Amino acid sequence: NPNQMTVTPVYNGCDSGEGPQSVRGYFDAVAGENVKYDLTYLADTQGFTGVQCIYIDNAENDGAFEIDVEETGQRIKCPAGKQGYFPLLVPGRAKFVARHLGSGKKSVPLFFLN
Amino acid sequence: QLTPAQQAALRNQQAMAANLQARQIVLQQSYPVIQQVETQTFDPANRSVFDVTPANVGIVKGFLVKVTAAITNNHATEAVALTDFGPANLVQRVIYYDPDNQRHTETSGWHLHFVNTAKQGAPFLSSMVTDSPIKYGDVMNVIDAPATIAAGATGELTMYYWVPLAYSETDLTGAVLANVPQSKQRLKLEFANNNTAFAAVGANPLEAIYQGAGAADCEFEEISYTVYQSYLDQLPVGQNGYILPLIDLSTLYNLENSAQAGLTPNVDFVVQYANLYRYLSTIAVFDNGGSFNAGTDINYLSQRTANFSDTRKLDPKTWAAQTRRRIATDFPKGVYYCDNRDKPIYTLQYGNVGFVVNPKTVNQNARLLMGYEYFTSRT
Amino acid sequence: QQLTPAQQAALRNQQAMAANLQARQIVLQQSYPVIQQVETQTFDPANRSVFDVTPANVGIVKGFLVKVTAAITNNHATEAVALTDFGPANLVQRVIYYDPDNQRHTETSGWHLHFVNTAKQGAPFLSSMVTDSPIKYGDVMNVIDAPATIAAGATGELTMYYWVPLAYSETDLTGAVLANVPQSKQRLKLEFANNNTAFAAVGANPLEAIYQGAGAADCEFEEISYTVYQSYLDQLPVGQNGYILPLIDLSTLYNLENSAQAGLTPNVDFVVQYANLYRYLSTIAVFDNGGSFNAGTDINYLSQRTANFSDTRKLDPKTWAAQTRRRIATDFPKGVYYCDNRDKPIYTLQYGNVGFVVNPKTVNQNARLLMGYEYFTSRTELVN
Amino acid sequence: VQQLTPAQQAALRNQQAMAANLQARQIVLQQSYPVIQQVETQTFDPANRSVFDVTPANVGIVKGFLVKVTAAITNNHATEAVALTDFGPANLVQRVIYYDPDNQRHTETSGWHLHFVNTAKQGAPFLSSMVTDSPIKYGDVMNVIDAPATIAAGATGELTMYYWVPLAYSETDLTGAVLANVPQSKQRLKLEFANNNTAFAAVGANPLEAIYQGAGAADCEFEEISYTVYQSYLDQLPVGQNGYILPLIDLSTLYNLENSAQAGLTPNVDFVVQYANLYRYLSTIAVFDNGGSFNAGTDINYLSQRTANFSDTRKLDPKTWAAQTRRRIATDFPKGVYYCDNRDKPIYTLQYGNVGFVVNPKTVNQNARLLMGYEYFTSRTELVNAGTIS
C-alpha cells in the first residue's frame, strides 16, 4: 500500500574477508554476471577499466539496487550499490572489447580517475 | 553418563521435542487467514517492477500471487505459440525481504513455479482429466493460456505462484513472526514485458511466453496482479504470551537459481553444492544454446560426493522415471528435477557434493540453469 | 480442593476424548470389515420413485454404497438432449437415513452427496484418470458413466454410484451406527429421478435434471435399477464389561444436509449464518443464478466471516477455485463452490457467529444459493 | 465373529524381538544412505537368447531392482499391421525370479503380474504421465513407459518398459529386504524376456502373453532388446559391540509375488481358488482368460472373498468390484483383470483353504481359466555372529 516504493539491501560497509575478483569480454550481445558465492564470497565495490575500448562501460546492480554504471574512456574506482541477493549485470556498447573489471570485496575508491 | 556428546545430543532432543510440541499446539489452537494485500493493473510498457508491502501481522507463511494478462498479436499474417514454460514466465523474478531486511527467496518465476509443482505432487493448480460424466474439469481456468494470439487479437492468460516463507502448512520451519513493531515485510515482483515475453523463430525461448513468426508484433495490452498474504490466525496464547515454535520461526527457507557454463561432450559437468545450506531439491535446466531436448542430448545425470561415488547415476529416462513418481508426469523438455527432501544435501555431513550432467551433445552457448530449494538454520 | 466445575468437566472430556480415541484404535486393530448386498430392485419411475430400503442389523454400520443404473430414451422426432452439469448425479434426487432409534442422520440431495463423495476422495468420485499409459487401463468398466448426448430416437445407458456415510471414514468411526442390539430400523429412503425431474427443456433450470435440450419433452426413463451394499464391521471385540465400543464415536451424528437461501442483490454481501452448535466440516454453495450456472463471472468474492467482520478467507472466485483444485485436483461444475473446514470445523460458541459469504456481481431473477453442509455436532454443556 | 484376529498376531510374535527389529531398522535408515546403482546392461537378439541371470552386488541392505527394457520391433509383413494387446509392453518380460544369498526364492511371477502390482503400489498406472489442463508443457515428454499403438506393415516401433522387482515392501517398510553384505555368496535375478514366439499373436489367437496382435503378426520380429538393471540398496551398514546392527524380523520375512493358473469353470457355479495357510496375502489379482477373450465384466456374475465362517466378506457385481479398484489405482485395470486389496488386514487362514477367492462366471468359453497373482508376506530365520581378523 502507498506505492510506489523501493527497498534495497547492501554489503556496502562491512568486510568479513578482504578479496579481489577477475575476468570478462564481449562484443554485441548482453553479458551476464551470475554470482554463486555461498562458500567464498562477499559483495563489494567494482572497478571498471576500459583501456583500448572506448565504447561505454556498463554496470548493472541487481533488482535491489538499480544503479546504472556510466563509463567512457580510461578506468576509475567505483563503488556499486549491490544487492545482498547476488546479482551482476554488464553491458558494453562498443564492439569487440576487453572488459577487465575488478570485483572488490572491500569498500573501495569512490572516485573516478583516467 | 554419556559425557560431553551426550549432553549436546540430549539438548538437541529437548529442543527438537519442544519444537514439535509447540508446532502441534499452534496447529491445533490457531487460525488460518489468507487476505488480499494489494492489486494493480498496468501496462508493462509503462512499468514492470513492483514493490509490494505485506501487512505486518502474526506469523507469515507465504503469498499467493494471482497474475492475469491480455496479449495481442498484431502481426499481419503469422501466429505465435506457447513456449514450454508459457505463462510461468509472466513473472520474471521474485524477491522477498523480511522485517529485518534479510533476503529469503530470490528466483525466477519459472523456477518458483516448478517448485510449486514439486511440492504439490502434480502440475501446480492444474485440472486433471478424467472420464467423469459429471462436468468437473477446467471450469474456472485457474492457470491458463491461449495457445496462440493471432494478429489483432487480445488473449487473457491466468497464472498463480505461491511464494513460500514457511516450508508447508504444517512445518513452519520458514514461518514469519509479524509480531515485531518496526520491522516490516518487502515482496518485489519483476514482470515480463514485450522484450522478454516474445521470442522470434530461432531465438532462445527460455524466458519467453510465446514464440513464433509473429513475435515482433506481439504486445501486452495489460497485466494485473493480486497478492494474497497467508495467515494462521488466532494464535494460541499461554502465560508467556504467544505459544510459538521458536526454532521454526528463526529458521529460513529459500529458493535461488544460477547459471553455469562450460559443458563439453562426454565429459562430466559438475556443479558443486555451495556447502552449509541444506538443499531440499535441485532443478537443472539444460538450455542447450536455445534448444531444449527431451533427454536425447544427455548421457546421464547424477549426484556425487567427494569420493567419486555416485548415489544415483542414471540415464535420462530412468532419471525421469524417478520424477514421474514425484509429480505424476514429466517436467518440460530439458528440465530435470532431484528430490532430497528427507535427506537434504549438506556438505560438512559428507564432504563436497555435486550435481552432475554428462552431455551427449553441446551446442554453442550451452549452459545449465540451476534452481535450488534450501534451508539455512542456526549453523 | 476447590471443584471448578467448568475446568473439571473439561478435564472429564479430555479423558473422554482420550478414551474414545483408544477405543477407536482398538476396534480398528482387533473386527473384520464386510460389504454385502442388502437389496436390489428394477423399476420404471413412472410407476414408483420412492423406496424405503431396510438395512440388516449387524455390528457397527459404516455406510452404504448405492449402485444406480438407468436406461433413458429420447423419442423426440428430431432434437437431441445433452447432459446437464450434474448429469447422472441427479439420478437420485434425495436420500434420508434413520438409525434404529429413528434418529435421522443424513438428509440431502443426490448432487450434494456426490460432491461430498468427491471431496472426501480427493478427486471426482470413482472416476478414471486419463494418462499416457500404453497398457490398456482406462474407462474399462464404466463405473460412473452417462452418454454426453442422447439423439432423437436413441436410448442411452447410465451408471452412478453414491456412498451414504454413517462413519466419517474407514479409520474414523465418528458417526457410525451401533448394532449390538435391539433397536427399531433405519429407513434408508431413496427418492429417485422421474420423467419430470430428469429432463429440462431449453431455457428451463437444469439444477435437478440429468439431460437438457430441445428433445426434452419426449424423453422417458425405460427403467432404473439400484443395488444397495451395506458396509459394516463384524466380530466386534469383547472385553470385560461386554463389547469394547467407542462411545463418543457411536453417539455422534455425522450428517449431510442442504438448504436454499434467497435474497441476493448486486455488490452486497449475502451472508448465510452457520446454524450454531454443529461442527461444520465442509460447506458447498451452489449459485443457481435464476437457472444460469456461471464459472465465477457473476461473483465478486466469497468468504467465511466471523462476528467481528473479520474475514479468514475473502477471495476472488479464481483464487477460491485454486484452493479447491488443491483438494480435488480439478474444479467442481459451474457455479459450485466448496470450502474445506475439516481440520478446524466451523463451530459457533468457539468464536461467535460465523457466516458463509457471497458478494454477487450479477443477480438474475429467482437467484438463490443452495447450501450443502457436512457436520458432526453433539450435545453441549455449562454452568456458573 | 470373523477369524483370524489380532490376538494371534500378538501370540505369533515376541514384542521384544519385533520392538528390537523395528528400532534397529530405524537406526540403519538414519545412520544409512539410499543408493540406486546400475549393475548390468545388455543388448541382444531374442532369436539367439531370451533368458538371463543377473548377478546383483552384495552390498548393504537390498531393497529392490528397477529393470529398464527397451526394444525395437519390426513388422516385416507385406501389407498387414498389428496393434498392441491389452498388456502390450508389460509383456516385454515374461517372467522374473529372485533368489537371495541363502538360496531362498522370493518373487517368482510373470512380467504382467509384477507390473500390475507396481501399479497397485503406486496408486496409479506405474510410472505414467497424468493428463491435465496445464498450459505449462508438462506431459509425456520423456516416454518413460511407451509403445506404438500400432506398427504398420514395413514399420519398426520402439518400446520402453520399466519393472520394479521388490524385496523390501516399500521405501519405509523394510519387511522383505535382503541383507547382502559383501561376503561373496551370490544373488540371482533371473529374467526371461519376450521372444519372436511369444510377442506376436495372430488374429484369433490368445493375446494374453503377447505384445502385439494382428494380421501381420506372423511376420513381426524383434530387431533387438536391451535391458539395464538398477539396484536399490541402503549403504553404511552399522556396526556395534555385537557387530552389524541388523533388523532380524524384516530379513527373515519374505515379501513375494507369485502367480498360478486354475481351470474348471462352469457357468453360474462358484469357482473357488483356495488361499494357502502360513502366507499373509496382501493383494490378489485374478485374470479371467475366457478362452482367449478378455471381457469387461460381462462374462462374470460376481466375484468375492469367502470364507470360512461368514460366508462372503465382499460378494460384488463386476462394476461394484471395479469401483473398489478405482479407489486404489484411480482407473480400471485392463479388461478381464480384477484386483483385490487386503493390505490392512491380510488374508491369513492358519488352516489351508479357510479362505478362498471366488468367481461365479456368467459365460465360459473353451479353454477358460483364471490366472492368479498374489502379493504376500511369510516367515523364512535369524542369529547374531561374525568375525574377521587380519
Swiss-Prot record, chain A:
It holds the Pfam family PRD1_P5_spike_N. GO terms for cellular component: viral capsid. Keywords: Virion. It is found in: Virion. It comes from the Viruses. The keyword Membrane does not apply. InterPro entries: Phage_PRD1_P5_spike_N (IPR015043). In association with P2 and trimeric P5, forms the spike complexes located at the 5-fold vertices of the capsid. Essential for viral infectivity. This is Penton protein P31. It comes from Enterobacteria phage PRD1.
UniProtKB/Swiss-Prot annotation, chain B:
Its main location: virion. It is found in: Virion. Homotrimer. Keywords: Capsid protein, Virion. Major capsid protein self-assembles to form an icosahedral capsid with a pseudo T=25 symmetry, about 66 nm in diameter, and consisting of 240 capsid proteins trimers. The capsid encapsulates an inner membrane and the genomic dsDNA genome. The major coat protein P3 and two assembly factors (P10 and P17) are needed during the assembly of the virus particle inside the host cell, when the capsid protein multimers are capable of enclosing the host-derived membrane, containing the virus-encoded membrane-associated proteins. GO terms for cellular component: viral capsid. It holds the Pfam family Phage_Capsid_P3. This is Major capsid protein P3. The gene is III.
